[PDB]
Amino acid sequence: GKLSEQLKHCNGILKELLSKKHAAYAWPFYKPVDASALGLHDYHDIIKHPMDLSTVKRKMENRDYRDAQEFAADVRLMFSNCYKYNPPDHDVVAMARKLQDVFEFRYAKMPD
Ligand SMILES: CC(=O)Nc1c(F)cc(C(=O)N[C@H]2CC[C@H](O)CC2)cc1O[C@@H](C)c1ccccc1
Numbered sequence: 574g575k576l577s578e579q580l581k582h583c584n585g586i587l588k589e590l591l592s593k594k595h596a597a598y599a600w601p602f603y604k605p606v607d608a609s610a611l612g613l614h615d616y617h618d619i620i621k622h623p624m625d626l627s628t629v630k631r632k633m634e635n636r637d638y639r640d641a642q643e644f645a646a647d648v649r650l651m652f653s654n655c656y657k658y659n660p661p662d663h664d665v666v667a668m669a670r671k672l673q674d675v676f677e678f679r680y681a682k683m684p685d
Contacts, residue, residue: 578684579641584633586679590626590648595675598668602626602651619658624651641683648676 590599605625608616617623629647631637638644655669 576640580633580638580644582683583638583641583644586648586676587626587629587633587644589679590672590676591630595672598671599626601665601668602655602672606654613658616658620654622650622654624648624654626651641680645680648680649673652676 589595591603602625604627605623606613606616606620608614624647629644629651632647633644638647652669652673655666659666
């Protein structure tokens, strides 16, 4: 159906975001932010709903997402967390912006 087809487009986007093509700026988003490892002892006080591409991949594989909108909400939550926690001129924010550009332009090519 339409939902299955739209979720296949989402899975295609997810595969691209995890691909070597985008690795130079995607890598901070591959796994959950390790707040303790990075010394970010305020991270989980500021970010109430952590999200990352490994979590999106697990949710896609487990058929957690019922539609494209639900998938997109998690990918955008991941970027929003980065923009909320970090100063806007930090390298990780520049990398978030670049990966979100990849995401938004391909998400816009969703089949109707
Ligand atoms: C997905 C994400 O956003 N991760 C992530 C993060 F939440 C915060 C910081 C970080 O160090 N923020 C600083 C902002 C200014 C404060 O005064 C000191 C903390 C770094 C992060 O990624 C590491 C791997 C990174 C490190 C360097 C370049 C790219 C990614």
